Amino acid sequence: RDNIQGITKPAIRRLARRGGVKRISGLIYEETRGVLKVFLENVIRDAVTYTEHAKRKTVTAMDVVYALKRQGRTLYGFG
Amino acid sequence: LRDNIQGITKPAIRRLARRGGVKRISGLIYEETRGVLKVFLENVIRDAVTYTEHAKRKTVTAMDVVYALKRQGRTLYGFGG
Amino acid sequence: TRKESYAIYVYKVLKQVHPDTGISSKAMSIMNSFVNDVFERIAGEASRLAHYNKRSTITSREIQTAVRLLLPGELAKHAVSEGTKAVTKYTSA
Amino acid sequence: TRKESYAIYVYKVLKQVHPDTGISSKAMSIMNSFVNDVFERIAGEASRLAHYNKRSTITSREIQTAVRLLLPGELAKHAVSEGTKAVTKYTSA
Amino acid sequence: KKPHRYRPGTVALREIRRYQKSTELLIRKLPFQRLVREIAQDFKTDLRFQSSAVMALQEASEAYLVALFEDTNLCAIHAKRVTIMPKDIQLARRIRGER
Amino acid sequence: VKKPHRYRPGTVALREIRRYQKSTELLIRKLPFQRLVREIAQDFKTDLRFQSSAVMALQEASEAYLVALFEDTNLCAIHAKRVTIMPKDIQLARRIRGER
Amino acid sequence: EFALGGRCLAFHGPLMYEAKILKIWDPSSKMYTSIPKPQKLGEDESIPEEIINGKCFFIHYQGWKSSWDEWVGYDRIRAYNEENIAMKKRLANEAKEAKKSLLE
Amino acid sequence: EFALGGRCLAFHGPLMYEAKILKIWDPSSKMYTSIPKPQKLGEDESIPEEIINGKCFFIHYQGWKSSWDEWVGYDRIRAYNEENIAMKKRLANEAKEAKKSLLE
Amino acid sequence: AKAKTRSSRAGLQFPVGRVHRLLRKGNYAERVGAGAPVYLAAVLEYLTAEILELAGNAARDNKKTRIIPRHLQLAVRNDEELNKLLGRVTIAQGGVLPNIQSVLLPK
Amino acid sequence: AKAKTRSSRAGLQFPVGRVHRLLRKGNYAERVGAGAPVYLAAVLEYLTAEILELAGNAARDNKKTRIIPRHLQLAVRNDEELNKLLGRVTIAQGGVLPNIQSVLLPK
DNA sequence: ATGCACAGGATGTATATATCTGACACGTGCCTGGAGACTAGGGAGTAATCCCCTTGGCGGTTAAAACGCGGGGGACAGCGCGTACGTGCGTTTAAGCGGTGCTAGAGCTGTCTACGACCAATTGAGCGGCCTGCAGACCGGGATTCTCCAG
DNA sequence: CTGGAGAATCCCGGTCTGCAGGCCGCTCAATTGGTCGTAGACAGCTCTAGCACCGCTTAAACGCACGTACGCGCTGTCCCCCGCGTTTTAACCGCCAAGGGGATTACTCCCTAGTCTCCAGGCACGTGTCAGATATATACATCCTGTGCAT
């Protein structure tokens, strides 16, 4: 049930490395998880909204694309 | 019309920073603030004049400025809307 | 010519909530701009919803979904309840 | 059924600029998304411009003004040049 | 026989409270109008201006500058300083997205 | 007299920064992120099914957001004459971005 | 030296301060003349009894605020001249010497 | 003591380290027995002649990379016991005092 | 029968008919349902009521009987969800919230 | 006579008729001019050509004959005006530009 | 004994060749979406009119800007410490992949019913113009608060 | 701590005025009632892909030891920005005058929507290479610690 712990410390470290971060405090990882969770909520909610307007039960890639577009994060490569 | 950015004086920038909650201001801040204000005003006025010219007008109206501000993600209430 | 605004309806609502409070012309202009901006947001989102689902009509379901998309938290739930109440009262009478 | 895209035209443009370079499917999908996004931005700005001036028609002047409003610096100049050249060639022919 | 001067920083807080309570414009109007006209001179010649357009420009510009100073102050406090510096403004504008 | 070889602190870190700024693959594991997505999508609706591309797009967007936030966090940490990112740096970055 | 609007330099203890004058007193007529003016003694204006009968002047000090205006007579108000500036610097130097003796 | 996969100790100058055995040598048959099995000397496996005729052991040292595997004869490798760990600490203290003399 | 406005039919203060006309004239869709203007007018009325109530509280706190842009700004920026809604909006002549960082306080 | 496309008349590679249909059916205005789809198709083709030229250059610098998302990301982010145009756009499988801050380098 | 400057072993990164695959490019059938032709009527272009509001000038007052100066306290640099990070190795874990299986639900088609556009007559809600009393702005002088320093 | 002193602000009457709010005439947009066509609600069918289970395999995560470099507290210097008095400038107000251009109204005409007919551009699907993947076997380039020079 603790699926936020599945976003492990090495993965956050890899993301920081791609972000150009050399040294990472020990308190970062938990903090990072929090931020990620919030972001996901803000997207997933909106996605589900579209899924419920179309009277669908399956969330499609276009619902995610629309939620991202309306939150100011346009994404290419998924339709 | 030349060298009017120096009409945005140091006391005015100081008051603007006081309203922002700033307690101590380095002496190299006023020129940077003038440059930032110039950039912002240029970006807004370019779109305002584009809107004025599309309408074949010669005077810039408040609505042109409002639409220019809205296009840049800065909605302004209270000027005709 | 003649220009239309929401001033009289804003004044009615103000006298409903604060019967002994006035309002200046600048504040009324700001409130009118607020109403217009919210109208534009909701209408544009409803148009996008209709287009996404291959529909020609903007119904109250699109308005409700746009309200849920554009309003945060408790505002969205209260607005949805108010809109449902208004539509029910309109359909009954 | 059949779903339309801009793939063939993007491929023709690619074979004009780089006559020996190919393109993968993911990159082509990204280019299709880019074309759709630009189309939507320009059409929306042109519609807003038309409504602002109380006009029912989207002409090429609306497109030109929208392009000047949405593209930065030299991109706007070059795009306006291409659009004017295309319109002149289309009308003369 | 002492001039009775205040300590450095109390008048600054006093005017912080003074200007965080009022709502009027903080820039002079004629210099800002001249600056607006001079900037617009390079986009179209013989332009006219409604007074409400200049008013809207001034309101938007001062709101923008006040918000930028509010971010600059956080950036300066982050460096464990009390004085704002141009690098604070640059970092704020870069994190916002303007740079 | 035998010594074991080991780089100094800050060498493997730079090697990894160069490695991961060169590739484009996703960095989070797929099944854990899928379980996280499916759990978050339960305070909204029950028995939701997901297309594979939906989860793929969610992962792309979330990783791009995290990488950009880490870049801003690194700038904030450097501004304070440091090389180590701390939660206050993330908080300041999100406050200046407008998220807070 | 001594005129309305003209400068003056007056003692105050072991130091002196330089001021600008606004009122000229006349004890024979008991009236002051000012500039924005033979006028009777003011309802809020007065002079200490040791200088109200002498040639007094209402001075405003330079570097001091507009509230330290003082009625000083010819006992302290001296003639602003070159020697006056010299003795101004002289008592400034002696004040510096006294401060250094307090310190070192 | 001396078995495939069992722990063993090994000398190196004045110090000692724990290793894991993977190939035990029989010289008369010239074959090593290995665990992932009597097999001959391989295309790259080879032992020097002064230890190829004795009971040798191909070991990998614990705490050291897999590039430093060593073919040690019966001369250094001892049977793993607690007395061997006591000797490990003996040589550890020897090296500690040696370095402390190098400095102090 | 005598004319009865749709606003009175739905029990609203905002004009349902004007909202319907604006929805039809805005090139939002080809057609507009019958219950969409009612819903939209109800939502706009509720939001106006919320902001007006908060602004009236803020005006009575400052001891005045009229709402000025300052009171609207105070109401919006003190309310968390209204601040989220109008997060990219500038209210003319509204000023700022009086907030001072603790590290700048005299110590 | 025989059918001739409008893109051929305008000297374009993008479909003028399809853009005209997408403008008519997109709820942008009541009427669409004759020269609007031509202008829009020309602008779209110009932007596509710019991006594809830069991406082909990037693919050649990597000694590849096919454009992948990485090349598009490099082309867009290395060009200043194209980076400003796609400021809020996320390209999937595109990565980031290789950039390490100076103070993090070994000194 | 300390900062400089080489030698060299370790190690992880880039190059070179080779083999294989599946992803891209090309080829063919077809069908529906665009092109050609034509009509009508209304949106837009043009010309005349007006009168508002934008620009320009000039004089007087004084608020605000500019300027000079002394001094506090804040910036910043250097130093010492200890501990919280990085590195690397042995071990455990679960992700990834391939496979089999089932069915919920996405997607599509056909029918026809109710709902929304459209139009003609009616009229009252809302806009504009006008007026006026009071909420609020502006004073001014006592009252009270806040800051500073000296004891 | 702790009175005083000086400055800043607050408070409470008294006067004045612009505009907020109410009233009024009128007109044009909302309402009502009836027609009609078609968008989508609804029911049914297909078959796609999403969820579930399971068995190997090995890459990755985890735990832990060790050490060192970095974050942080502390101290000292100096310089630069603040508080404040004095002089200077030009912003602001008021008042007026001319005319440019935005708004309005009438008239016309051409250009775009609508409709029909037709045919080829583009799309869906089927094949076949070869660019890229993947694997293994070598040059480089750095990292880093041990050499010497000698100050």
Author numbering:
A (entry chain B): 23 to 101
B (entry chain F): 22 to 102
C (entry chain D), D (entry chain H): 29 to 121
E (entry chain E): 36 to 134
F (entry chain A): 35 to 134
G (entry chain L), H (entry chain K): 7 to 42, 57 to 124
I (entry chain C), J (entry chain G): 12 to 118
Quote the study on this structure.
To explore the underlying molecular basis, we reconstituted the H3K36me3 modified ‘designer’ nucleosome and prepared cross-linked Rpd3S–nucleosome complex for cryo-EM studies. Focused refinement led to significantly improved local maps, with 2.8 Å for the CHD–H3K36me3 nucleosome, 3.3 Å for the Rpd3S complex of the close state, and 3.4 Å for the Rpd3S complex of the loose state. Of note, the two CHD domains of Eaf3 became visible in the presence of H3K36me3 nucleosome, with Eaf3-B CHD recognizing H3K36me3 at the DNA superhelical location (SHL) +1 site and Eaf3-A CHD bound to the H3K36me3 mark at the DNA SHL +7 site. Although the two H3K36me3 marks are symmetrically related by a dyad axis, simultaneous readout of two methyl marks by Rpd3S leads to its asymmetric engagement with the H3K36me3 nucleosome. In both close and loose states, the two CHD domains are similarly anchored by the H3K36me3 marks. The CHDEaf3 domain adopts a chromo barrel fold and binds to H3K36me3 as well as nucleosomal DNA. The trimethyllysine group of H3K36me3 is inserted into an aromatic cage formed by Y23, Y81, W84 and W88 of CHDEaf3, and is stabilized by cation–π and hydrophobic interactions. Moreover, a G83–W88 loop of CHDEaf3 contributed to DNA contacts through electrostatic (K85) and hydrogen bonding (G83) interactions. Structural studies revealed that two CHDEaf3 domains cooperatively bind to a fully methylated H3K36me3 nucleosome, which oriented Rpd3S over a nucleosomal disc for histone H4-specific deacetylation.
The Rpd3 small (Rpd3S) complex recognizes histone H3 trimethylation on lysine 36 (H3K36me3) and deacetylates histones H3 and H4 at multiple sites across transcribed regions. The Rpd3S histone deacetylase (HDAC) complex recognizes H3K36me3 at coding regions and suppresses transcription from cryptic promoters via its deacetylase activity in yeast. Here we solved the cryo-electron microscopy structures of Saccharomyces cerevisiae Rpd3S in its free and H3K36me3 nucleosome-bound states. We demonstrated a unique architecture of Rpd3S, in which two copies of Eaf3–Rco1 heterodimers are asymmetrically assembled with Rpd3 and Sin3 to form a catalytic core complex.
